[model samples]
Target chain A: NEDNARFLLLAALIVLYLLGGAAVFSALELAHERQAKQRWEERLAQFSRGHQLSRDELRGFLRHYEEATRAGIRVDNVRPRWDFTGAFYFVGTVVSTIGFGMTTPATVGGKIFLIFYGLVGCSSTILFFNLFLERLITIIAYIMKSCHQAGWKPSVYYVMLILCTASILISCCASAMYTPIEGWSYFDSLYFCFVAFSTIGFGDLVSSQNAHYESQGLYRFANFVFILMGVCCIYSLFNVISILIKQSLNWILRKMD
Target chain B: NEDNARFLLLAALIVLYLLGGAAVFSALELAHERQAKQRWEERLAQFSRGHQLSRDELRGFLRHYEEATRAGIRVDNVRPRWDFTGAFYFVGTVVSTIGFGMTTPATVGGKIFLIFYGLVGCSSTILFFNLFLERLITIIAYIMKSCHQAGWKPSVYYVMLILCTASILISCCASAMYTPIEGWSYFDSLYFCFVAFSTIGFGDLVSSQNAHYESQGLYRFANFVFILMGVCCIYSLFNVISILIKQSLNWILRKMD
Candidate 1:
C-alpha cells in the first residue's frame, strides 16, 4: 500500500513535469519558428522572381539550405578543421554518448579511436553521475526534512519540480551566454541546451561551430567544464525520474497480481 | 583482491569489445565509404567539366546537392507524408527516447505532442526492458546451472560476450532485410541498426524513409515488432555489461580501502 501510494505520486509528478516541459519548449520555439518560416518564404519569393528559377528550382534551393544547416556546412562561409577546443567538445559528446553525428571525425584513425574513447568515456560518465546523484539526493532529503520540521511541509512533487526547474534554468543561463557567440536566437539556444542535456542530441544545432568559443584555450576549457557540470546535473535529475518510474512500474505489476 | 581481479578482467573485456567493434565497423564500412567517395568524385568531375560552371559556381552546386540529401529530399524524385506505418515507427523511436530526429514531425502541434509522447514512451520502454532483463537473466542462470551440473564451466564474461555478440547479429540480420527496402548498403544498414540499438541514434540512416515500407500496414507493423525486439535484446546485453562494470568498480574501491 505504501509502495502503491508512492508510485501514484511519482506517476503524477512525472506527468506534470512532462506537460510543463512541453509547454515551455513550445512557447520558446514559437517565435523562432515563425521567424524561420518568414525567412524561408522570403528566400523562396526572391528565387521565384528569377526567370531562370522555376518552382522546382526554388524548392531545390530551400532544400539545399536545410541540408547545409543539418550537415554543419556554412553555405555563407567556409569553416576550418577541428581545432583543439573543438576536439575537446567532441570528445565530451562522445564520452557522454550524445553522438550527435552532425560533425564526426573525418580521418579513418579518428573514427577508429572514437569507439575506444566512447567505451571508456561512457562508463566513467555513469560513474560520475551515480556519485553526484547520491549527494544530490542527500541534499534533497535534507531540504525536505527541514521543511517538515518547520511545519512548512513541501510535497515531494514540489521539491522535485523545483529541482528540475533549477536544472533547466542553469542550462538556460548557459544558453543565454551562448546565443550571441553561436548566433542562435535565445529560444534556439535554449532548445539546443535542452536537447543536449536530454542526450537526444539532434545534431541539427551544435555550439562547437563557434570559432570564438573554440579558439581560446581558457574559453574552451571553461566551456568543457561548464558542459560536463550541466551534463552531470541533467543526469542526476534523470536518475530521480527513472527511479520513480521503476517504483511506479513495480507497484502496478504487483497490483495486477 | 577478488574485486580488483574482476575489475581488471572487465576492463580487459571492455577493451576487447571496443577494439572488436571498431575493427568490424571499419571493415564493414570500407567498401561503402569508397563507393560513396567515388560517386561524389564523379559528380564533382562532371560539374567541373561544364565551362559555365566556374569554381565558385561549382561549389554552390555541390553545396546544394549536399543540402538536398541532408534534408531528406531526393534530388531526382519527390517525397510524401507520414502515413499510419510512419506514425508507428515514429512513436517507436519516441518512446525509446532515441529521438533520432531523422523523420521528425513537421507540424507545430506534432512537435508539441512529441514531448509528452517521449516522456510516456521512454518510461514504458524502460519498464519493458526491465521485465525482459529479469526473465533473460533467469534463463541465463538456468543455463549456467545446467552447464555446471554437466561438468562444464563457463565464465560470466563468456556468457556476456556471447549475449552482446548475439544482439549485434540480430540487428545485423534486421539491417540486411532493411538494406533492400531502404536502398542502403549492407554496412550502412548494419551501422544504422547498431546506432539505433545503442541509443546513439545518429539519424544519418533511418528506415522510415522507405515509401514502400511506410505504405504497407502489415509490413510496417512487422518492422516495428522486429525493432522493439532487437532493442530489448540490446538493452539486456547492456544491462549485463553495466552490472559487471558496477561490480568491478565496487571491487576496486573496496581494495583501495
Candidate 2:
C-alpha cells in the first residue's frame, strides 16, 4: 500500500512538473516578445523624428536595429522534448555540472534570480539525496545481515567488483556525451562532474555566456530538471563508496583483532 | 594515527578558509579601487572639458560642481565610528536575511555580477552545510542511542526540546530583524525566508538595489562581503532544519516500534 501511494504521488509530481515547466517557458517568451516590441517601437519613433538621414543611411540603421532585436530570438517556441527516462538522464547531466553550457537564464534580473534559485533548489536537491542515502544504508545493512545467513563467499566479492566496474562505465558514458557541449576533453568533463556534483563551482567553465537564445532557454529549463535527477545518482554513488569503505574497515578490524 | 591526520587536515582547511577569505577581500578591494579610479578619471576629464567654456558659463558649472563635490563639508574623511559595528552587522545581517537593507551592492554592474557570483557561491555554501549536518546528526543520534540504552529517559525528550527551541528562536530573531529593512511585516519576512532558504525564490524581494556607489572603492567592496555572509547564514539555517527533521523522525520511529 505504501509503495502504491509512493508511485501515485510520483505520478502526480511528474504532471505538476510538466505544467510548471510549460508556464516558465511561456512566461519567458512573453517577456521576450514584450521587450522586442518595445525596442522596435522605440526605434521606429526615433527614426521617424526629424533628423539628418540619407535613404541609404536610414536603411543601414534599420538593418542594425533588426539585428539588435535578434537578441530576443524566439526561445520559447522550442519546447523541450524528453520522455520520462530521457528526462531523468537530463537531470543527471544538469546537477553533475556537465551543464553543457547550452541553456541558461537570459535576462540580467532572471539570471540574478537564478543564483538564489539554483542555491535553494540545489540544496533541497542534495537534502533529498542525503535522506535517500540514510535510508539506503539502513536497508543495505539489513540485506547484508540476511545474506550472511548463507555464509560469505568469494562470489560476493566478485559481484561487488562487477558493480564498481559498471558504475565507472556509466559515469564515463555521461562524461562522453557532455564533452561535445562543454568543449572539454573526456577527463575534463569528468572533472566537471566532480566539481559540479560536489558543488565546488570553480567557475573555470560556465554555459550561460556562450549559449544562443533558443538553446539557452532549453538548457536552463533542462538543467532545472537535470539537477534533480543528478542528486539521486550522486547519492547512489555515495552509497556504493560508503559500502566499499565499510567492507574495507571491517576487514582491517578483524585482522587487527 | 588516522584520527590525528584527520584533525590536521581539518585545521589546515580552516587555515585555508581564513587565508582565502582575506585574499578575496583584498582582491575585491583592489578591483573596486581600480574600476573606481578609471571611471573617476573619465568623468573628471569630461567635467574639465565642460570647464573650458566661456568664463561666465564655466563659473556657473564650477559652482554646481563644487556643491556636488561637497567642497564646504567638514574635514571628516573617515566613516563615522558609530557605523562600524553597524557595518559588520550588515555583513551578518545580509547573510541572515536580517538584510536591514541599510546597505547593498549599488552599481548596475556590481548588482549584475553579484547575481551570478551569489548563485555559484551559494552552491558551495550549501555543500558545506550538508557536510556539517551529517556530523550534527551523528552527535545527536549518539546521545539518543545512549539515553535509550540507559533507559527511555526524560533526558532524550529534553535534548529534543532544547534543539527545537533553539531552532525556533534563531528563526524568530531572523524574522524580527528582516521585517524593517525589507519593509514587510512578520509574515512577509517569514515568507521571504521560506522562499529564500527553500530555493523557491519567487523573486519578489531582493536586496542591494540602490545601496552601492559606482565611485567608492570601499563601499562596493564592503557590500560584497555582506552578500557572501548572507548566503552562508542561509546555508547554515538549512543545515539546522535538516538535522532537526532527521532527529525528530528517528525519535518518532523509535516510539512507534
Candidate 3:
C-alpha cells in the first residue's frame, strides 16, 4: 500500500518537473518564435514586392514548397541523400535513438521496416551501452583494487569525480572537432554533442550535413568514432549519476522510515 | 584477454547490425526519396508556369521558408505555438527524449537551459520508468505467487509472454484512439504508437499537430495518458528483453568456457 503511494508520488514529481520545464522554455522561447514570425512576415512582404506577387500567390508557392518538404524532398541539399552513405547515417541515427529527423522513412514499407528495425535496434544499442558500462566499471574497479594495494583506496565518489571530469574533457575534445568545421561557436558545438549523445537530438544543429566536404566518407568515419567514444563515456557518466540518484533516493527513503 | 575479445565481439555484432540496418533502410527508402525529388521538381515547374515566376525566384522563396523554419517560424499553423500549452508539449517531448523536432530552441539562452534541463529531465524520466517497471513487475510477481500457492507456478518466460500480450493489447487500444482522430490508417496509427513509445519519434506522423479541435485540452490529455501508459509498458518490455539478452550472453560465455 505504501509502495502504491510512493509510485503515485513518483508520477506527481515527474509531472511537476514537466510543468516547470514548460514554464522555463515557454518564457525563454516565446520571444524567439515571435520575432521569427515577425521577421518572416516582413521578409515575405518584401519578397512579394520584389517579385510582383500577391500574398495569396506567395502563400501558394509556400504551400507547394511545404508539401514538397513533407514528401521528403531536400530543396537545400546539393545532392540526393538516399544513396548508400547518407542512408547509413540515417540508420545510425535511428538505431542510436537520435532519430535526427534529417531523413525519415516515407513509404509504407519503409515505415514498417523502421518500426521493427527500431524495436530491435534501439534495444540492442541500449544493451551495448549497458555492457560497455559494465566493462568500464569492471576496468575501473580492477584499477581501484590495484590502487588500494598501493595504499590509496578510492571511494565510489572518487570514481564518480574522475568520470565527470573525463566527461567534460571528452566533450571539449569532441566539440573541438565540430566548432570550426560547422562554424558553430564552441558553446553551440558542445551543446550539439550533448544533444546527440544524450539522444535528445533536437535536430537543431546536426554536426555533419549537406553543407560540408567530399572526403565526406573520411569525415563521416571520424564523426562516427567520436560519437561512439563520446556516447560510451557520457553513457557511463549517466549510469554513475543514476546510481547515485538511486542511492540518494534510497537513503532518503530510509530516513523517512 | 578473453574478456577483452568478448567485449570486442559485442562491438563487432552491433556494427554488423548497424550495417544491415543501413542496407535495409537504404534499399527501401531510396526509391521513395527519389520519387519525392522528381515530384517536387515537376510541381515547382508547374507552379512557375501558373504563377509566371522563374525557378531562380522560386528557389529564393524556398530559401526564405527554410531559413524561417530554422528560426522556428510556423507557416502552416494558424496560431503561434510558444504559448503555455505548446511549450508544455515541447518540454514533455524533450524530457521524454522524443525530440520530435516540431519546435526547437532558437535562442542561445534557451539552448543552454535545454542542455541542463534535458540532462536532469531525461534522467528523471528514465528513473520514473524504471520505478514504474519495478512496481509493475512486483505486482505481477505478487499475483503469480498467489497463483503458485494455488498450484500454478509461472516461469520467467510465462511472465514475459503475458507482458508481450499485454503490450500488444495496449498498442492496439492506443492506436484505436489515434486512427479516426488523426485520419491515419490503422497500420499507420499502430506505427505511430510504436515509433513514439520506442522513442525513435521520426516525426513523420505526429499524432496531434497544427490541426483541428476546440476541446483541444481534452484531446491533449488523452494523448498524454495513452503515450505515458504505452511508454511504461514498452519500456518494461525492453528492460525484460535486455535482461534476457544479458542472461543469454552469460550462458553462452559459460558454455564457451
Candidate 4:
C-alpha cells in the first residue's frame, strides 16, 4: 500500500507520455484531412477527373488494390502470451515452432503471414524498444535530479535530452557486457541485442549449447532473469519512443505552417 | 547534385545523432563500472561487518556463475560485424524466427529459448522503435520550422514541449486506425503492435483483411508502405529516449560533488 502512491505517479506519467505521442498523430491527421479535402475540390473542378472514370475502370483499380492488401498480411501464432511476468519463462515456444500449437490465426491468410511476419515485425520492434526505454529512464533520471537539492528546472526537453543519452549508454553497456560471454565482438554484442529483442528466430550463433547447464530450476531461473531484463529494458524503450513521436509531430506541424 | 548534397546533410545529422547516442553509452558505462565496483566493495564490507566468507565460499560463487554462463545457462547471440542495414535485417530474423529455418541458433539451450524468444522479443523492440522514429521526425519538424523563420535554439525547451504534445496525438490516431481493420480495442491494438512486431510468428490479426481490401499488388504495396511508415515512426521515438539515457549518466558523473 505504501508503494501504491508511487505506482499511481508512474502510471500517470506513462499515460501522459501516451497522450503526448498521440498528439502528433492528431496534428498530422488533421492537416492531412484538410489537404485531402483540398485535393478533392481540385479534382471536382474537372468533371472528367471526378465523374469520368468509366465505372469499370474505377472498379478494376479498386480490385487491384484490394488484391494487394490481401497479399498484405499479419500474423502472431508461434508463442502464447505471458501473463506480464515475462520476467520469467518467456521464450520457449517462439523459436522451435513446437508453438505448443496452443493458438491459431482467425483466418487462412493470418495463419500464413504468422510464419513470416515475425522476421520484419520483431526487428522493428526491438529497435523501437531500445530507443524508447532509454528515454523513459532519462525521465526518471531527471526526476531523480530535480528531487535532489538545488536541481534545475527539469523541463520536459531536459528530460528528453537526458533520456536520449541514457539510451545510447544502455546499448553500449549491453554490447560490452555481452562481448566476453557471447564471444561476439562489440558489433556482434550490439547485434545480439537487436537479434534477441527482435525475435527474428534466426537460430544461428545462439547461446544454445551450454553443455554444462543442467536443466535445473536455478539454471532456468538465472536464464529467465537475464532475458527478462533484456525484454523489460527493450519494452521500456517502446514506451519512451511513443512519447517522442507525439512530441515531434506537434513540432513538425507548427513548422509546416 | 544539390539533392544529393541535401541527402548527405541528412545522413550526417543521423550520424551525429548516433554518435551522440553512443557517447552517452560510453559515459554511463564508465559510471556503471564505478557503481559496480562500489557494490563489489560493499559486498566485501558485508563480509567484514559480520561473518567473513571463506575463500572457498567466494570461489564457489564465482565458479558457479562462470559455469552457468559457459554452459549456456545464459547467452548473447548476435552476429559479428553486421553493418547497420545488416543489423536491421538481423534483428528482423531474431524476433520473428520466421527462422526461414535458414540461419538459426546453434547452442542447444539457445535453441530451446529461441522458441519463445522469437515470440516475445518483439514487444520491447517495437516499443523502442516507435520512440526512435518519432524523435527523428520531430527533428525534421524542427528543421522545417527554421525554414519558416522561427527561432530555433537548444535553449528553447518549448520546442521539445511541443514535440511531446504532437507525439501523443499521433499515438492516438494510430491506435484508432488499427481498430476498424483489426477489430481490436485500443489496448489490443497496442498489444498487437507488440505481439506482431516481436515476430513471435503469432497470427492473430492484421490489415488488408477488411472487406474493402482484396488481393492485389497495389493493395500489397499500400500495406507495405503503411507498415514501413508506421515502423519508422516508432523507431524515431526510440532514438530520442536513447539520447536522454546517455545524458543523464554524464550529469551524474559531473556532479560528483
Candidate 5:
C-alpha cells in the first residue's frame, strides 16, 4: 500500500530531523550548559562556606526545599493555588491542553479529577478550535477573493502569507504586553508567546505566576486573553502550514520514486 | 447569523465547565495545599534552627540556587544535557509539543533556533499524526466492518467503545512499565500516561530523565516508543470522542433552541 511508503518516509524524515536538531541544539547549548554547571558549583561552594554547612547538610536542605517546591509551596501569590481563580487558570490550561506545570494536582482526588476533566475538556477544546479555524478561513477566503477581483488571482500561498504576517504581529504585540509585566527581555517574551500559543506550555516561562505584584484579577484575565488569542492565530497558521508541508512531502516522495 | 447562537452556547458551556471544575478542584486541593504550606514552613524553620543561618543569608543562597535550577543545572545523569541524546530528547519534545521544560534553551541562538524549528517541526509532526490517524482508522474500519458482518449493524458508538478500550489498555500497559522506573505509584504513573499521551504534558512527571540508573540507550528509545505509540492510540480515541462530543453539543443546542 502507498500508506506503507508514507509511513516509511515520515519515519525516516523524523529520524533525520531529530538528528539534525540534536546536532544544532548540542552545538547551541553545550557551552551554556558547561558555563552554568561551573557557576552553580562555585555558587554552592560559596554558600556552603558562608553558612559553615557540610555538603551533606546543604544537600539535604536543598532536597527538602526542592520537594516543597514540587508540592507547590514556593509560589507566593495573591491567588492561592487551590482558590477559585487559581482553579480557573488550571482548568483553562487543562481544557486548552497548555498543561503549564506551575500548579499541578498533588492529591489523589485532584489527580483523578484532572484525568477525567482533561478527557472532555481537551476534546471539546479541539472541536472549538476547529470551528474557530473554519470561521477564520472562511473570512480569509472572502478576503482573498476580493483581493483577486481587485488585482491578481491569488493562490493558497497568498493567504498563507497573510496568516504568517498576522501571527508575527499578534506575537509581537503579546510579547510587548508581557515584557513589561513579567519583566522579561523582549526576545524571551517573544519566545514565551510562541511557546504558549503553540500550546507547548513550558512552565519555565509562564506569566501570572507572580500575581502578588500586579492586580490578580486583571493580570489573570489578561494572561487568559493572550493565551486564547495567540492560539487562534497560531492554529490558523498551522492549518495552512500543514498544507504546504503536505505538498512538499508529496513533492519529495515523487522525487524519491 | 445563527453562528452567534452556537458561539454563545459554546461560551456558556465552557464557562460552566470551568466554574464546575474550579469548584471541584478547590474542594479537592484545598486541604492538600494547606497541609503542604504548613509542612513547608515547619521544615524551613527546622532547617534554619539546625543551620543557625539568618533568614536573609538563606534566602539569598536559595535564590541563587533557584536561579541555577531555572537555568537547567540540577539534572546530573549519564546524559549531560546538550549531548546528542539530550538534544534528541529536546527536539522530540518540541516536535511533539510536550515541552517538558526540564531542558529548555538558555542561549539566545538556541531560543531563536527552537522557534524556527518548532514552526516547521510542530507543523510537520501534526501532519505526521494526521497520517497515522488516517491509517489507524482505516484498520479500525476494517475490523469494525468485519465485526458488523458477524453481529448486528454497528453504530459509531460501537467503534468508539473499541477505541476507548484500546486507549485504556495502552495506558495501563505503559503505566506499569514506568511505575517501577519512575518509582511513581501505579495511579500516578497512569496519570502521567494520560497527561503525556493527551499531549497536555504537564512535565510534573516525565520518564527516562534519570537514565544514569538504567541503560541510557534502552530507556531513551523505550521512552520514545511509549510516547509515539500512546499518542497514536489516544489520537485515534480522541477522533471518535470528538464526534460523540459534537453530537452531544448539537443535541444540547437543539434543546436550547
Candidate 6:
C-alpha cells in the first residue's frame, strides 16, 4: 500500500512536468509560427512580382511549394558538398544514428566512406554507451543503498522519479547553453535536448548547423562529445525506468495470484 | 589463436559488406544526383521566366536562393501537419529516436502533444527494445548451447558474425519487399533500411512518404510495426557486437598480464 501510494505520487509528478513542458513549448511555438508566417508571405509576394501571375495561380503555386518543402526538399538553396569539418560532423551523425540528413554525402566516395565510417563509429559509440550505463547503474545502486541506510526506504518508482527529473534538468541546462548561439528560445532548446537525448534527433533544431559552430572545430568536437554522453545518460535513465516498470508489473501479477 | 582468427574473419566480412554497401549507395546517389540537378535547373529557368530577368541577374538570384535552402528554409513546399496517420508515424519516430525530423509539428498544440507523447512513447519503446534484446540474447544462448553440445567451440566473434549476417540479410529482404511499391531501386531501398535500422533516419527516403503508402492506413500501420521490430533487432545485433568486443579486450588484457 505504501509503495503504491509512492508510485501514484510519482505518476502525478510526471504528469505535472509534462503539462509544464506543454505550456512552455506552446508559447515558444507561437513565436516561431508568427515568424514563419511572415517569411512565407514575403516569399509569396516575391512570386507574384517575378511571375506576373494572377493571385489565384500564385496561391496554387505557393501551396505546391509548401508541399515540396514538407517533403524534405530544399528547392530554394544548396549546401557545401564535402567541406572537411562538415564531413566530420556528418560522419558523427551517421555513426551516432542521429542522421539529421540536413546535408548528406552527395558524392559516391562520400557514400562509400559513410558505410565504413558508420560501421566503426557506431560500434565504438555503442561500447561507450555500454560503459556509461554500467557506471550510471553503479551510481544509482549506491544512491539506493544510502537511502535505505538513511531510513528513507524509497520505492523503485520514487528513485526512478528522482533520476528522471535530474536528467531532464540537466538537459534543460544544456538547452540554456545552446539558446543564444542557436537563436532558439529556451523552450525550443529544452525540447531539442529532450528530442536529442531520446535519440529522436529531429535535425530541425540542430545547433551544429549553425555556421559559426560548424567552422569552429572545438565546437564540433564538444558538440558530439556532449551529445554522446547525453544520449548515454538518457539510455541509462530509460533502463532504470524499465526496471521500475518491470517491478511494478510483477507486484501486480503477484497480487492477482 | 582460433579466437583471433575468428575475429579477423568477422572483421573482414564486415569490411567487405561495408564496401558492397558503398558501391550500391554510390550508384543510387548518382541516380538521385542527376534527377536533383535537373529539378534545380528547371526551377532556375522558371525563376528567370517569372522575373524576365537578365541571365546575369538570374545567376545572382539563383545563388541567393541556394544559400537560403541550405539554411534549412524550403521556399517551395509544405507538409501535412497532424493528420492522424502522419502524427502516429511521427510519434513512433520521436519515441524511437529515429527523429528523421523530416516533418515536424508546426502548430502549438501539436508541439505540446509531442512532448507528452514522446515522454510516454519513448519510455514504452525503450521497454520494448529491452524485451526484444532479452529474447534475442536467449535465442543466441540456445544456439550457443547447441553448438557446444555438438562439440563445436566457436569463438564469440564467430557467433557475432553469424548474428550480424543474419540481421543484415533480414534488412535486405525488407528492402526487396519495399522496393517495388516505393519506386526505389533495390540498392536505395537497402540503404534506406540500413539508415533507418541504424536510427540515423535521414528521412530522405522514408517508405511512408511514398504517396501510395501514405494513402493506405494499413501501410502506415505496417510501416511502424516493421520499423519497431527492425530497430529492436538492429539494437540487439549491435549489443551482441559490443559484448564480443569487450570479451576480446578482456582476453587481450589477461594475456598481457
What TM value does the first chain of each candidate achieve? 0.62, 0.37, 0.88, 0.37, 0.90, 0.61
- List the candidates' TM-scores in order: 0.68, 0.32, 0.92, 0.31, 0.93, 0.68
Q: Higher TM-score: candidate 1 or 4?
A: 1
Please give, for residues B19-74, the per-residue lDDT of candidate 3 as tens digits. Answer: 88778777777777777778878877887898677778767767888898777665
Q: What is the interface RMSD of candidate 5, in Å?
A: 1.4
Q: Candidate 6, residues B168-199: lDDT per residue as tens digits?
A: 77787677678777677876776777788877
lDDT for residue B117 in candidate 3, whole number 0-100 = 83
- Per-candidate chain B TM: 0.64, 0.32, 0.89, 0.36, 0.90, 0.63
Error of 3 at A144 (Å): 2.9
Candidate 1 has which clashing residue pairs, if any? Answer: none
How much is A91 displaced in model 1, in angstroms?
Answer: 2.8
Clashes of each: 0, 7, 0, 147, 0, 15
lDDT digits (tens) for residues A90-209 of candidate 2: 233333323322222222343334344344334343444565544444555557677776233233344455444544565576676567764667765655454444333333443333
CAPRI class assigned to model 3: medium
Residue A249 in model 2: lDDT: 41
Question: Which CAPRI quality tier does the interface of model 1 achieve?
Answer: incorrect
Candidate 4 residue-wise lDDT, A139-173, digit = tens: 57667776783344455565556544554566676
What DockQ, between 0 and 1, does each candidate earn?
0.19, 0.02, 0.68, 0.05, 0.72, 0.24
Q: How would you encode candidate 5's per-residue C-alpha lDDT over A13-82 as one tens digit per residue?
A: 8889889999989988898788988999898888778767889877778888888888776523434687
Cα DockQ of the candidate 5 complex: 0.72
Global fold similarity of model 3 (TM-score): 0.92
Per-residue error at B189 for model 2, in Å? 3.0
Instruction: Please write out the lDDT profile of model 2 over residues B154-192, one tens digit for every residue.
Output: 344454455545545555666675665545678656545
Alpha carbon lDDT at B118, candidate 4: 36
Query: Which is the leading candidate under TM-score?
Result: 5
Ranking by DockQ: 5, 3, 6, 1, 4, 2
